[PDB]
Write a structure and sequence with these properties.
- This is part of a larger assembly, with chains A, B, C, D, E and F.
- Chain B is mainly alpha-helical.
- Chain B contains one helix and one strand; from the N terminus they run H-E.
- The longest helix of chain B has 14 residues.
- Chain C contains two helices and five strands.
- In chain C, a hairpin with a 5-residue loop joins strand 2 and strand 3.
- Chain C is α+β, with helices and mostly antiparallel strands.
- In chain E, strands 1, 2, 3, 4 and 5 form a five-stranded parallel β-sheet that branches.
- In chain E, helix 1 runs antiparallel to helix 2.
- Chain F is mainly alpha-helical.
- Helix content of chain F is about 45%, strand content about 0%.
- Chain F is built from three helices and no strands.
- The chains are: A alpha+beta, B mainly alpha, C alpha+beta, D alpha/beta, E alpha/beta, F mainly alpha.
- The interface between A and F is medium-sized, with 27 and 23 residues.
- Strand 1 of chain A pairs antiparallel with strand 1 of chain B, so a sheet runs across the interface.
- Chain E binds four RNA strands through helix 1, helix 2, strand 1, helix 3 and strand 2.
- Chain E: InterPro entries: Ribosomal_eL18, Ribosomal_eL18/eL18-A/B/_CS, Ribosomal_uL15/eL18, Ribosomal_uL15/eL18_sf.
- Chain E: Keywords: Cytoplasm, Isopeptide bond, Methylation, Ribonucleoprotein, Ribosomal protein, Ubl conjugation.
- Chain E: Its main location: cytoplasm.
RNA sequence: AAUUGUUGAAAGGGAAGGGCAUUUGAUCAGACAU
RNA sequence: AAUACUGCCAGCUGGGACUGAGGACUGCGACGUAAGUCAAGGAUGCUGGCAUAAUGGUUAUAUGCCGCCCGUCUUGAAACACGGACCAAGGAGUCUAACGUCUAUGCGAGUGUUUGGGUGUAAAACCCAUACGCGUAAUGAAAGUGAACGUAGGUUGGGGCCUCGCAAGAGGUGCACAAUCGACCGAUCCUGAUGUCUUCGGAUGGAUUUGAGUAAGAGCAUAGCUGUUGGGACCCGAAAGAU
RNA sequence: AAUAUGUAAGAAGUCCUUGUUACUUAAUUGAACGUGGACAUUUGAAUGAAGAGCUUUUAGUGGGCCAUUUUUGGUAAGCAG
RNA sequence: CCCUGAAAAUGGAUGGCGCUCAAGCGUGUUACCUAUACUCUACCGUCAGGGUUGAUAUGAUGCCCUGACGAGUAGGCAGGC
């Protein structure tokens, strides 16, 4: 196979075109995020100016991290944790928010800390602790080629494609989140901010729906 | 429901559109604006304890 | 036979190491090590003595001098981490430093077979020292107590807080 | 052998693979077949359902020689003809020269009718023949001639 | 710790390489391992996996079974593949010419096949004749008909062939088998 | 062989995300939003400051 | 081997023994010498 | 207007600690028109001292912290529960008859030489006739009867193969196996043909009946682990009974 | 009431036509099983599936104890159930 | 909150010392300490998925790549001394 130059040129051209497509898609996604957040802010401002209240839409996804160990767990919460793939003590998973998943979270309330992650939290999670599920093996999300090989069926071509399908619950969110391996997060740097974790966050504890406060905890635990 | 999905699927195929035949769990409610025209909020506070016995 | 020969002898050649990627960029020196700064030696033969920083040598070392007429520290090189950079700067433009490089302090190595080292200075080195120190002494003299200061040797006194002591 | 036995693997283990609570005692459930109508009843009714009791009349001084009657089916009926003559007789299907098969001399008593046979005549000599075996042989074109 | 949802370190449970010191069988296993590695033909995988089966798992396929398989429409000229032993059947009389490939052939079965006009082939010759198993028909002997199987799963109202040593009127057909004596199974 | 973090390694960051270069060039992380001045309604302000 | 004598070393405020880690004393291999 | 608070930056930058796994290139990518360079699929560069008990190992000791006596019965043992003063040697799931599952092997509708004969370099090895044992036929108490309507059947799912197709898939063939509906053999209950030692024969056709059956054989023999039974039966142990 | 609990959420299905029958209906009426034809990527809610299904054989065990909650006998018990 | 109610036998126990705008009680916010837990890395082993015919320093039971996992009496099996 003395002909290597043609193969190199073809591969380089294909990679250049793929990188250009990924760049244009990421630019479109950045424009979309800016447009959505600025539209939400301006809608709030306009309602307040007109004399009303703008009730934001309920968040579409949650991030759920186990907080409890593995010993002495009742069967129903244990099974729900297994179904949410929070096997280890500090594993984490994104979950679409519907009635069924809300009931799931209510069943596993005393063993998880969950909220709605921001784009910053989601992006940092995918970049640092993003791992795939190729051939039942947990491969790291090192290059966009790995993501294109498996999720090219659904149009998820890049890691930012994956982040987009995660942040905006989309047509293939189930497939994207299933492809993402359960994140193994470290303990929160600087502690949990609480003397005792095993009370609901409302009760001055750590578990339960922390909602918007989940970002700080997840960033510390990353 | 089986024949209902049959009817919707036939109609969607005739009109060349997606079927979306699956049910969906209760989705989170979308964003909406609540007016105050004749609905000024009423301030509510706890009630002090008074025995009825 | 006392021990049966193994079926498989491992390969005998030495495999070359892979192409490492550790290209050397020149060392960045902290801003306090401006040439012409009065430093203090914290380790070595001349520990505690104050010297003048002249040139950053080709390798990561600092060429320093007493100047030798005061406190008897000759032209040496030291390491940045082993000196403390005071704020008593002295002008250095009056001396020539291009001659002194890494090869200038070349040690004539003696093999380990000698073992008879139980019992002199280069004349070139003594003349360079006498010219550099005589060129630096005039710069030193322009300020009141710098010569006596360089003759003195640094030493922590009781109650000193190196975390709060300015330099 | 004795080196592959699990006893060698059990050296160093206190109970030697026989448990700590219910140690290997002499005979906890009685000797062999003890308590068939008793504590072993569940096993003896689950795996040997028709054991206890008696069925049928007796036969004093029964001799198996009288009952000697090995059975032979038609598919195997062509085996008693020697191998080399087999194709010669199969090819030459003739009522004039159909082969004689002495099943008794071979060692069989009864000829039964399982399977088919090629459509060639054959004189079969048999102590006993089933109805269907005789029907099949006669349909093929031979004759079942009884002997003794 | 891990909330283990599956039994850890459990073996796949399937035989890999035969549990036999037959050097020639090992050679065939090596050959078809290479073929299954570097060929996308599922025939290679299935024959490699069948090379491992035990004796009770490799029932002897009869030449009568061979003929019945060849009787199938569109499979008259196919090469029959048998990972096992082919046995002579003195019940059939007309046998069709074919190329039968198997590990071991009984003397009678080999004689029958060569007399019919076809030729007997060993699995290495099969590999050199059809690397991807083209025009091949895999046969298999009957598994459920061995003597030991009839006793399996015995219980009441199952009728699974009691393990009685000596069969007779007295043995294992008294009370518990007929309604007059006790009950019925 | 090794897992290099995109966040703390600019090289692998640019590998994973081609948009990172133009993002840094345009300083989109500290974008200056346009200043639009609208005032909340007196009803809202009174309801906020109400007992 | 249990057990005992002498010599030598060491420790020892109502047990001795042990694990992790090092100071101290005694003792010791390998490698540059290629 | 600022600031506090919260949040973001694919903003910059300083100090510290641990790690250096891999070993020709391959891949992704960045800077450069380019050559090439690079922090880009895991450490390199420069320098110093020692080159021997210096590092390290072993051992004794000190110090800091931890450390209950082992085996056994037990829900629970350090137990104020039992055995153990110490040491050397001996010391406890073996063998056999019959076997169950699984596995290896030889032959395979056959299989098993070794009861015996022949032979022998002599308890070895080699050869062999006739039978018998098991299997190729089951069922019934027994008399007895005794397994193809058919391409050894129909339906469903089937690995694999074949045909078409770039593939997705479609069609054909579909062994093994699984479910089911039938056919046949036997038994039980029925129906009772030709006929006739006129009381014998049981043709044909049925049954929410059942049998350890047939439905193009799968067994025999040897060896092995495990398990079962009788044997002293894993080792040691009675009060007793008899001659 | 709460907690627990059964079933279903399709391909072994649905729709159209017409076949078999000794069952059934006054009647091809109906019942069961069928021939042929039609369906899509959402093939009939969510989540997860670490492979799914199946077989043989066999060990030890068959003295239990405690904690939250419900609860019986008892005044109660480191009581008994 | 404190005091009386408040009596048991060897000397004695917020663990001890001891503590009084506490080192007590109630509450709030930070900082900090450390498990064989969590995160990353190395190594050992196991399991699983794979690559490798090229003559072969041979041996395909060999070499190599990827991922996850590792507690345990009775007991089972395997590899070994």
């Amino acid at each position: 196979a003395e002909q290597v130059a043609a193969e190199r040129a073809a591969r380089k051209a294909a990679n250049k075109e793929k990188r250009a497509i990924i760049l244009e898609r990421n630019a479109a996604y950045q424009k979309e995020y800016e447009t959505a957040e600025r539209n939400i802010i301006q809608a709030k401002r306009d309602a307040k100016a007109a004399g009303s209240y703008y009730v934001e839409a309920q968040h579409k996804l949650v991030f759920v991290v186990r907080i409890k160990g593995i010993n002495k767990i009742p069967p129903k919460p244990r099974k729900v944790l297994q179904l949410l793939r929070l096997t280890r003590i500090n594993s984490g998973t994104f979950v679409k928010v519907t009635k069924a998943t809300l009931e799931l979270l209510k069943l596993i309330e005393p063993y998880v800390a969950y909220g709605y992650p921001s784009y910053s939290t989601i992006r940092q999670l995918v970049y640092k602790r993003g791992f795939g599920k190729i051939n039942k093996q947990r491969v790291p999300l090192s290059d966009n080629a790995i993501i294109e090989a498996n999720l090219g069926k659904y149009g998820i071509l890049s890691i930012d494609d994956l982040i987009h399908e995660i942040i905006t619950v989309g047509p293939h969110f189930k497939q994207a989140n299933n492809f993402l391996w359960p994140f193994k997060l470290s303990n929160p740097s600087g502690g949990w901010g609480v003397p005792r974790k095993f009370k609901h966050f409302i009760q001055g504890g750590s578990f339960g729906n922390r909602e918007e406060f989940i970002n700080k905890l997840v960033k510390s635990m990353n | 429901r089986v024949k209902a999905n049959a009817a919707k699927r036939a109609e969607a195929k005739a009109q060349g559109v997606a079927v979306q035949l699956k049910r969906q769990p209760a989705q989170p409610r979308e964003s909406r604006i609540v007016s105050t025209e004749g609905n000024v909020p009423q301030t509510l506070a706890p009630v002090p304890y008074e025995t009825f016995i | 036979t006392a021990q049966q020969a193994p079926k498989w002898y491992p390969s005998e050649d030495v495999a070359a190491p892979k192409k490492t990627r550790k290209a050397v960029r020149p060392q960045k020196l902290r801003a306090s090590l401006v040439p012409g700064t009065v430093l203090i030696l914290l380790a070595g033969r001349f520990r505690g003595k104050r010297v003048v920083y002249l040139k950053h040598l080709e390798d990561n070392t600092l060429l320093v001098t007493g100047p030798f007429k005061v406190n008897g520290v000759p032209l040496r090189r030291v390491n940045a981490r082993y000196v403390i950079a005071t704020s008593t700067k002295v002008s250095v433009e009056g001396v020539n430093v291009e001659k002194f490089n890494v090869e200038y302090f070349a040690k004539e190595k003696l093999t380990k077979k000698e073992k008879k080292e139980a019992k002199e200075i280069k004349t070139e080195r003594v003349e360079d020292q006498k010219v550099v120190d005589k060129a630096l002494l005039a710069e030193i003299k322009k300020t009141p107590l710098l010569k006596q200061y360089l003759s003195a040797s640094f030493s922590l006194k009781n109650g000193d807080k190196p975390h709060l002591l300015k330099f | 052998p004795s080196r592959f036995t699990k006893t060698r693997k059990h050296r160093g283990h206190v109970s030697a693979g026989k448990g700590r609570i219910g140690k290997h005692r002499k005979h906890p459930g009685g000797r062999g077949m003890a308590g068939g109508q008793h504590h072993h009843r569940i096993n003896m009714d689950k795996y040997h359902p028709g054991y206890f009791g008696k069925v049928g009349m007796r036969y004093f001084h029964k001799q198996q020689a009288h009952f000697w009657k090995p059975v032979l089916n038609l598919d195997k009926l062509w085996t008693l003809i020697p191998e080399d003559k087999r194709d010669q007789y199969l090819k030459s299907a003739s009522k004039e020269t159909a082969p004689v098969i002495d099943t008794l001399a071979a060692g069989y008593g009864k000829i039964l009718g399982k399977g088919r046979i090629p459509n060639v005549p054959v004189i079969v000599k048999a102590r006993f023949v089933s109805k269907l075996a005789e029907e099949k042989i006669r349909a093929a074109g031979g004759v079942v001639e009884l002997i003794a | 710790g891990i909330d283990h949802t599956s039994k850890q370190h459990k073996r796949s449970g399937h035989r890999t390489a035969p549990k036999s010191d037959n050097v020639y069988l090992k050679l065939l296993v090596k050959l078809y391992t290479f073929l299954a590695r570097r060929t996308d033909a599922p025939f290679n995988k299935v024959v490699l996996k069948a090379l491992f089966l035990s004796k009770i798992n490799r029932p002897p396929v009869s030449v009568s079974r061979i003929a019945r398989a060849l009787k199938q429409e569109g499979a008259a000229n196919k090469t029959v593949v048998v990972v096992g032993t082919v046995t002579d059947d003195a019940r059939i009389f007309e046998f069709p010419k074919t190329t039968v490939a198997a590990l071991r052939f009984t003397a009678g079965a080999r004689a029958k096949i060569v007399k019919a006009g076809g030729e007997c082939i060993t699995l290495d010759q099969l590999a050199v004749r059809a690397p991807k198993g083209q025009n091949t028909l895999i046969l298999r002997g009957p598994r459920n008909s061995r003597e030991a199987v009839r006793h399996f799963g015995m219980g009441p109202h199952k009728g699974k062939a009691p393990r009685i040593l000596s069969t007779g009127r007295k043995f294992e057909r008294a009370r518990g088998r007929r309604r007059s004596k006790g009950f019925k199974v | 062989v090794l897992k290099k973090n995109p966040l703390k390694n600019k090289q692998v960051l640019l590998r994973l995300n081609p948009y990172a270069k133009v993002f840094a060039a345009e300083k989109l992380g500290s974008k200056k939003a346009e200043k639009t001045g609208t005032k909340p309604a007196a009803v809202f302000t009174e309801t906020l400051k109400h007992d």
